[PDB]
Every structure is written in C-alpha cells, then in structure tokens.
Amino acid sequence: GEYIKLKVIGQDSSEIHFKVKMTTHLKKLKESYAQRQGVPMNSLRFLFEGQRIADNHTPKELGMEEEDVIEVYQEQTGG
C-alpha cells in the first residue's frame, strides 16, 4: 500500500508523527504511542475530529489524509 503521515498531539502539546498505510488497524499506532509515553494503553483515549478511534479502525475507514491530527486524552468515567 502507501502511507500517510498522522500527527498525534498530547495533552502537553507534544507531538509524535506516525507513517501508516491506509489499511493498517490503528491499534498498532495506539500501542506505539503509549509505549513511548510510558503509560498503559488503556489509560489513554485517541480521538479523530473528536470521535473515538477503535482498535480495528483504519485511516481509510475514518477518511484520514496526509498530515491529519489525532488528539490523545486520558480515559474517562463510564464506557
């Protein structure tokens, strides 16, 4: 396939960029980000246009393009 570059913005305004294929499940991006922050993956929620990114979402499914932004927040009360 071919790759797009996504920018992941943290609560402290820091950024890590990820190159990902249009068909790759975004679980792998979440794991890498959490690993690099040194926190459990389940302590974080990952949002695209404010909507929750699921483990089996792909960039194609979400309509993501080159240089789109993902925001990371702490997980919230409830489901």
Binding site: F18, K19, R36
Partner: peptide, 12 residues
Amino acid sequence: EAEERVVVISSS
C-alpha cells in the same frame, strides 16, 4: 524545543 519524531508503523 523538541526534535521531529516520525515512527513507521508496520501492517499485520
């Protein structure tokens, strides 16, 4: 100021 960080994610 932080340097640029780009990580390549592989498929399955």
